[PDB]
Design an enzyme around this catalytic site. Sequence first.
Site, PDB file in Angstrom:
ATOM      1  CE1 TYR A  62     -81.208  60.321  25.175  1.00  0.00           C
ATOM      2  CE2 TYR A  62     -80.742  61.387  23.069  1.00  0.00           C
ATOM      3  CZ  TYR A  62     -80.390  61.122  24.388  1.00  0.00           C
ATOM      4  OH  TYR A  62     -79.220  61.652  24.907  1.00  0.00           O
ATOM      5  CG  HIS A 112     -78.559  54.523  29.498  1.00  0.00           C
ATOM      6  ND1 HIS A 112     -79.586  55.064  30.241  1.00  0.00           N
ATOM      7  CD2 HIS A 112     -77.866  55.571  28.994  1.00  0.00           C
ATOM      8  CE1 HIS A 112     -79.517  56.383  30.188  1.00  0.00           C
ATOM      9  NE2 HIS A 112     -78.479  56.716  29.443  1.00  0.00           N
TER      10      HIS A 112
END
Length: 293
Positions: A146, A284
């Site tokens: 991430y 997302h």
Amino acid sequence: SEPWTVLAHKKPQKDWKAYNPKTMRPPPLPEGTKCVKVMTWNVNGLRGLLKFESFSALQLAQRENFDILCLQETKLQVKDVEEIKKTLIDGYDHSFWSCSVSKLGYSGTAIISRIKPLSVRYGTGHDTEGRIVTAEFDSFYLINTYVPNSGDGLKRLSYRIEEWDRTLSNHIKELEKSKPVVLTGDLNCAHEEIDIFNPAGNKRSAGFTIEERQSFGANLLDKGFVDTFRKQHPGVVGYTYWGYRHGGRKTNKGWRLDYFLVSQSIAANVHDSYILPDINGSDHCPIGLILKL
């Protein structure tokens, strides 16, 4: 209604089309072809996603039958992992979680696998924000990351470009010396204009700065890594993220921030690098990769 099949882009080229997974994914592999299936998802808070009424781990597994699930932004604390592990559905016994320890309820990554890795390490074991998990498999490395958001006003752009981006690059190149690398996760960069709905309106937005895009090219692609979805779909507008606030998902006003990047050595083994824009529960949506072994 499938808004992701409507081409939404402020400055498109003439021959660009919107990504439709129903008509643009390749046919399934011949049966018995040995392969690995990976799904990747920024879940925007794992606990919140599990409270999402229309979400079921069982149906997702049944639908896609992935071998490995890579998550970003779990937002878990270390103390939470024992209990979260108990809610894992049957068949996925090997799970590995890297949680943020300085900032709590923040960042966080995980790899959930029905394949037992040869080794798993966290970080480049220091991972203060829980942003990287590396699982070793027999023929490849899987890196789930991430990437740090540069933030409002680009307040973190210096750490992103000068520190983070180079450290991730060095980590994957070092591992590549032993096995090819599959890099996946939320890379927090829309590489080209085709990867963002409004390029002109976002020249100074986190994720589409000239600095971030050039680093992406220079520290990832030009070091022997392939944007699998872009190679498979030249001239195809497909997004993986839609900001909540301006309600852009209903009109496909989105960005592609989530990727499968693979070593040049296995780029020919990628059968399908795809997006699942219909799956809700986060800002997302998931992406998937089918890799021939």
